[PDB]
Amino acid sequence: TLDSRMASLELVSQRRAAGAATALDYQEAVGLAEQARAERESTERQLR
Amino acid sequence: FKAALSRAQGELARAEAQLFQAQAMVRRYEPLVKIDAVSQQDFDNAMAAL
Amino acid sequence: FKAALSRAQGELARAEAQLFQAQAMVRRYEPLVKIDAVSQQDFDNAMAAL
Amino acid sequence: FKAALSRAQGELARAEAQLFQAQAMVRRYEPLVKIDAVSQQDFDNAMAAL
Amino acid sequence: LAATDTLRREEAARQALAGSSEAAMALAKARYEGGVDDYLRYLDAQRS
C-alpha cells in the first residue's frame, strides 16, 4: 500500500511539475503518503 | 439604423462585460499561479479566455 | 410582419427572463460576498452575467 | 471594409488564442502520457482539440 | 525499544503530514485572500 502511495505521489509530483496539477493536489498526495508511512510504522510495531 | 446601432452597442456591452470578467479572473489568478495555488493549466485557460 | 414582431417579442421575453434570473442571483450574492459566504470570483461572475 | 477587416481580425485573434491554449495543453500532456500520468483518452482529446 | 523506535518514525511521518496540511493552509489562505476561494474552503482547510 505504501509503495502504491509513493507511486501516486511521484506521479502527482510529475503532474504538478508539468503544470497540469495544483500544489494542493501535490500536498494531499504527500499527506496520503505520510499517512501510509505512519500506518506502516504502526504495523511494524505490532509485528515486533 | 438607430435600432441597429442599439443592437450593435448591446452586443458591444455584452462583450465588454465578458472582457471585464476575464480581466478580473486573470488578475486574481496571476499571483496565485506564482505560488502554484492554481495549476499552470488553469492560468493558461484563464489567459486564453482573456 | 405581425408574426415577425411576435417572434422578436418572444426573443425579448427570453432575454428579460434571463435578466430577471441574473438580477436575482446578484441580489442574493451581494450580501453574501460581504461576509465572504461566496467567493469573490463567483460574485464577479454573477455581476458579469448580470 | 476596414471595419469588416477589423472584425475578421478579431475572430482570427480569438482563434489564435484558442490554438495557443491547445498547444500548451498538448505540450504539457505529451510528457505526462508517456508515464501514464494522464489517461490515453485525455491525451487523444487534447490532440483532437489541438 | 520496538515501540520507541517505531513511534519515533511514526511521529516523523505525522510531523511531515502536519507540515503538509500547513502548506495546504498557506495555499488555501492565499486563494481566499485572493478572492478565488470562499471562506468555506478556507475553514475546511483549517479543520483539516
Sequence-ordered alpha helix ranges (H) in C1-50: 2-34, 40-49
**Identity of the residue in A23, A38, A45 whose CB atom sits nearest the CB atom of E13:** A38
Buried b (16+ CB within 10 A) or exposed e, B23-46: ebbbebbeebbeebbbbbbbbbbb
Residue C42 in contact with partner chain E when CB distance is under 8 A: yes
State which amino acid sits at residue A33.
A
Q: Resolution, in Å, please?
A: 3.0
Element of type H or E holding A16: helix A2-17
The verdict on a CB contact (< 8 Å) between A22 and B35 is: no
Cell numbers linked to E36: 478565488
Instruction: Say how many CA atoms lie within 13 Å of D22 toward its Cβ.
Output: 13
Phi first, then psi: give them for residue C39, nearest 5 degrees. Answer: -65, 150
Cell numbers linked to E35: 478572492
Pick the residue from chain C with its C-alpha nearest to E41: C39
Chain B positions touching A20 (Cβ under 8 A) are: 39-41
Tell me the shortest Cα–Cα distance from C27 to chain E, in angstroms.
Answer: 18
Of A3, A29, A6, A5, give the one whose Cα is nearest residue A16: A29
For chains B and C, count residue pairs whose Cβ atoms are closer than 8 Å.
13
Contact D22, D46 (CB under 8 A): yes
Contact E9, E17 (CB under 8 A): no
SS3 content of chain A, % helix, strand, coil (to 5): 85, 0, 15
Contact B48, D21 (CB under 8 A): yes
Identify the experimental approach. Answer: cryo-EM
Distance CA E48, CA E27 (A): 13
Distance CA C32, CA B35 (A): 28
